[PDB]
Amino acid sequence: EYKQVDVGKDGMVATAHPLASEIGADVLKKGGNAIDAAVAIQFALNVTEPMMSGIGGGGFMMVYDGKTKDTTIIDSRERAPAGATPDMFLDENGKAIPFSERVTKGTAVGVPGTLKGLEEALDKWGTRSMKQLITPSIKLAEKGFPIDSVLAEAISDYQEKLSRTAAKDVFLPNGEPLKEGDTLIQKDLAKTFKLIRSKGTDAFYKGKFAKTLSDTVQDFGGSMTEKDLENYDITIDEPIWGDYQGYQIATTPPPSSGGIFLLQMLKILDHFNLSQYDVRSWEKYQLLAETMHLSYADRASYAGDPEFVNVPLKGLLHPDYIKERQQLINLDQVNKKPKAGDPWKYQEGSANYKQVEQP
């Protein structure tokens, strides 16, 4: 039966769902490579962990190429449509639309990039066709699979928003949320996958599917058009690298805030050498907490899409800046007013945006 830790001589797959891990492992066992397996996995997760990811969203796929030895990122982050505007999430009085409500609006839908990113990946490193790789997920969607406790919970927990769209025909069968044990069948999704299998991503970014999605986003209030989908292209990002304990870390650059701040928190913590303290000591937690407070403050002030704003990446990781931040941390007291620092002092240029508190 399925394991949460395994070893292998010829490869390895680790995913949040057994059926997706089985599909990706099947691809490797039959001779395909990690990228082929990853694409297979993404379609499988789209079907079996539907509330978590899919061709309706986007992601960051980092790939180390064993042939060329280079590491790159297929950035499939969604883009706001051309009709989106800076205050689209504010009400008529200038106040933000309550979050839980904001989440269900058409204006919240980004132009999906996942399918485009899988296409790009296969194009660069694939050894199996999208046709071969998507087929096992067409079967899970078409013929179904039994849902566990978790998916059953998500369904009940989100019944209200699901009950408001066509999504209720799949997850809220008659008027009831599918329960653990029930078979989840996704016939329309299987149809879409079969269209992608024969037509390619054009099946998604152009044609009829494009028009229905665009039309639906409009029906729920957003401004997405067919041209927005026609305009979409993923981005190929270079990893941000950092030296750490003798290792080199390749992580995600903006539009993600992840890579910069993972590196910044590690550099900040270096001054305090955590392992001199027991892993569950209050000291270790105290230091992680104070470090997170500084880095998340910097994230909130300086992180954004780099095609649009100047993110002071060199400054946020500059050793003297890191030293300034480490200076603010004390084992024996809490900084009750943690604030972003000034990384611009350690690099050229200035922000082309302001500091605006968010609700």
Partner: protein, 182 residues
Amino acid sequence: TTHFTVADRWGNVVSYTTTIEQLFGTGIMVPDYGVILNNELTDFDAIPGGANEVQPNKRPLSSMTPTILFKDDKPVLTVGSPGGATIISSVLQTILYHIEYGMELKAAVEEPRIYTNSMSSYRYEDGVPKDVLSKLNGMGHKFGTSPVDIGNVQSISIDHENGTFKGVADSSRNGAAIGINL
């Protein structure tokens, strides 16, 4: 959001975080096509003017951190996780535990994490000693009355010495690691 990773016989390595934002995203499905649509644009700032303000054709700031660690130019570890702004903290913690504390990969992944982005936002997992939480709150921290799971780290280690692979899925979800033999 979900994170998975794959490594093959040829040296290729994949660390991939992917999402539709909230669970079920907007909740909107393309009628007749079964595709649930993301609500990714709410990751933009609701009040404009800052680095992460909404702009036409701009991408909303993400926290996804698929990462690969190298030792002597060979990939030796992959890490990633779902969790919104907490992703950064889960990935940071797994690296800290596996690298600085030297813990075996699974144990590093399962080590109770904490998360706090401001003086009013704190989270901790079951296992953070209650006496420690009381000492930290005693100093001004605001950890709550109950634990919550944080993140879901899938990770692969690669031992180039023995030419072997090790996969781990976080017990926070029902994930699975499967090694390949032949």
